Design a protein around this motif. Structure first.
Motif, PDB file in Angstrom:
ATOM      1  N   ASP A   1       6.147   5.371  18.687  1.00  0.00           N
ATOM      2  CA  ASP A   1       6.046   4.378  17.515  1.00  0.00           C
ATOM      3  C   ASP A   1       7.431   4.497  16.960  1.00  0.00           C
ATOM      4  O   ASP A   1       7.503   4.373  15.522  1.00  0.00           O
ATOM      5  N   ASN A   2       8.466   4.344  17.641  1.00  0.00           N
ATOM      6  CA  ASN A   2       9.816   4.354  16.965  1.00  0.00           C
ATOM      7  C   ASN A   2      10.196   3.112  16.114  1.00  0.00           C
ATOM      8  O   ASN A   2      11.263   3.240  15.300  1.00  0.00           O
ATOM      9  N   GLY A   3       9.560   1.939  16.371  1.00  0.00           N
ATOM     10  CA  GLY A   3       9.813   1.034  15.429  1.00  0.00           C
ATOM     11  C   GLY A   3       9.850   1.012  14.029  1.00  0.00           C
ATOM     12  O   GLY A   3       9.168   2.101  13.478  1.00  0.00           O
ATOM     13  N   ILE A   4      10.137  -0.287  13.255  1.00  0.00           N
ATOM     14  CA  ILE A   4       9.588  -0.134  11.941  1.00  0.00           C
ATOM     15  C   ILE A   4       8.601  -0.387  11.466  1.00  0.00           C
ATOM     16  O   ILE A   4       7.867  -1.421  11.305  1.00  0.00           O
ATOM     17  N   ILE A   5       7.827   0.512  10.913  1.00  0.00           N
ATOM     18  CA  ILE A   5       6.365   0.578  10.607  1.00  0.00           C
ATOM     19  C   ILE A   5       5.999   1.034   9.161  1.00  0.00           C
ATOM     20  O   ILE A   5       6.763   1.567   8.508  1.00  0.00           O
ATOM     21  N   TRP A   6       4.916   0.803   8.460  1.00  0.00           N
ATOM     22  CA  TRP A   6       4.299   1.011   7.273  1.00  0.00           C
ATOM     23  C   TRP A   6       2.772   0.716   7.389  1.00  0.00           C
ATOM     24  O   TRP A   6       2.461  -0.300   7.121  1.00  0.00           O
ATOM     25  N   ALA A   7       2.277   1.592   7.521  1.00  0.00           N
ATOM     26  CA  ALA A   7       0.321   1.561   8.154  1.00  0.00           C
ATOM     27  C   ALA A   7      -0.346   0.935   7.035  1.00  0.00           C
ATOM     28  O   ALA A   7      -1.333   0.193   7.306  1.00  0.00           O
TER      29      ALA A   7
ATOM     30  N   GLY B   1       0.760  -1.155  -0.069  1.00  0.00           N
ATOM     31  CA  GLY B   1      -0.095  -0.075   0.030  1.00  0.00           C
ATOM     32  C   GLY B   1       0.757   1.198   0.103  1.00  0.00           C
ATOM     33  O   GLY B   1       2.044   1.449   0.368  1.00  0.00           O
ATOM     34  N   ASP B   2       0.404   2.410  -0.324  1.00  0.00           N
ATOM     35  CA  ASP B   2       0.730   3.721  -0.523  1.00  0.00           C
ATOM     36  C   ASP B   2       0.942   4.398   0.728  1.00  0.00           C
ATOM     37  O   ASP B   2       0.096   5.306   1.054  1.00  0.00           O
TER      38      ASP B   2
END
Lengths: 251, 109
Positions: A223-229, A146-147
């Motif tokens: 939310d310092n972690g590696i994310i990509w909603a 997703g974008d």
């Protein structure tokens, strides 16, 4: 074990077009760069030359780094791709922004569940250090991830989706705040990205062993972690990640 | 030992991201722990590896000779001295980067 191939070129592509075949380390020299440097190529049985420039895997290398670090690069380059790393913005910029042919970023993703998802972006560039290393693509090009670079409405706010849009952001590290925030996006998360206020995509985050976490996981509560909603919850950090680029005609 | 020397020793030296001309540049270029790095002085020269001391005094130290366990023969002819010889670094315990240094002579030219 770690070796270096004798094939040169302008990008991982020109290598594969010249004769290459093996997912490994080579030396590329883009037109305007002064001295040739080392990249981890990624060739499939097709002819595609994927200049990779980001990875996460385990947690070994820590991405909480200063301006001159992200500028120049930090981590290690395995020819088996088993090592985390950031290639360095000056390099990104130098590769992508050679004229007469635009690149395209592929983010790749993975989880602590085994599932793998991609997401593409078109006409990719990073702007000079002058422009504070600016992210500029043409359009999201599809992919089951997703974008995320087109913002995301998270909690309650209406224009937070406007505040997490990433296309057109300059790079911001703790010692060089260029993000649009009263405080410092880079510091409350301890990382280096193209922050806005703050992020919908965060591939250079604080790794978490296991994946799932919360506010209580850090003193801050952020939310310092590696994310990509666009693919996952904000309280789930990826196992693996990637970012590569390629001349567009190869798509 | 002659039987041991049928099968050589192994190292996995994952060349780290940040390069430079010399171990000096590399410390300025944000590289700030002691391990093996690749460097390139002039452009007409093929790059080569080297162990930079960063902890000692103010870093930027381009180690060009080392001894600590005799692990390498030095009784060599002119040519091996001209080209260099020996181990640059060694996989520190259970890690992916070569953190400890090895006995070498970085070579003459």
């Amino acid at each position: 074990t770690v070796q270096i191939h004798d094939i040169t070129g302008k990008d991982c592509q020109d290598i594969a077009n010249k004769g290459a075949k093996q997912s490994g380390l080579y030396f590329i020299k883009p037109l305007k760069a002064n001295q040739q440097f080392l990249v981890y190529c990624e060739i499939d049985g097709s002819g595609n030359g994927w200049t990779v420039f980001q990875k996460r895997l385990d947690g070994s290398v820590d991405f909480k780094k200063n301006w001159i670090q992200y500028k120049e690069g930090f981590g290690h380059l395995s020819p088996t791709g088993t090592t985390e790393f950031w290639l360095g913005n000056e390099k990104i910029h130098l590769i992508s922004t050679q004229s007469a042919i635009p690149y395209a970023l592929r983010v790749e993703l993975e989880d602590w569940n085994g599932r793998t998802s991609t997401a593409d972006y078109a006409m990719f560039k990073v702007g000079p250090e002058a422009d504070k290393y600016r992210l500029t693509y043409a359009y999201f090009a599809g992919g089951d991830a997703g974008d995320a670079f087109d913002g995301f409405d998270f909690g309650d706010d209406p224009s937070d989706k406007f505040f997490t849009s990433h296309n057109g952001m300059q790079f911001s590290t703790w010692d060089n705040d260029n993000d649009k925030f009263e405080g410092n996006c880079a510091e409350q998360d301890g990382s280096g990205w193209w922050m806005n206020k703050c992020h919908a995509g965060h591939l250079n985050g604080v790794y978490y062993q296991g994946g799932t976490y919360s506010k209580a996981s850090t003193p801050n509560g952020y939310d310092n972690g590696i994310i990509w909603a666009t693919w996952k919850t904000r309280w789930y950090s990826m196992k693996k990640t990637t970012m590569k680029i390629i001349p567009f005609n190869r798509l | 030992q002659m039987e041991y020397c049928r099968t050589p020793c192994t190292v996995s030296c994952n060349i780290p991201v940040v390069s430079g001309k010399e171990c000096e540049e590399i410390i300025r270029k944000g590289g700030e722990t002691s391990e093996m790095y690749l460097i390139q002085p002039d452009s007409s020269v093929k790059p080569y590896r080297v162990y930079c001391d960063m902890n000692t005094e103010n870093g930027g130290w381009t180690v060009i000779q080392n001894r600590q366990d005799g692990s390498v023969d030095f009784g060599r002819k002119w040519d091996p001295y001209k080209q260099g010889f020996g181990n640059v670094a060694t996989n520190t315990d259970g890690k992916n980067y070569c953190g400890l240094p090895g006995e070498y002579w970085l070579g003459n030219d």
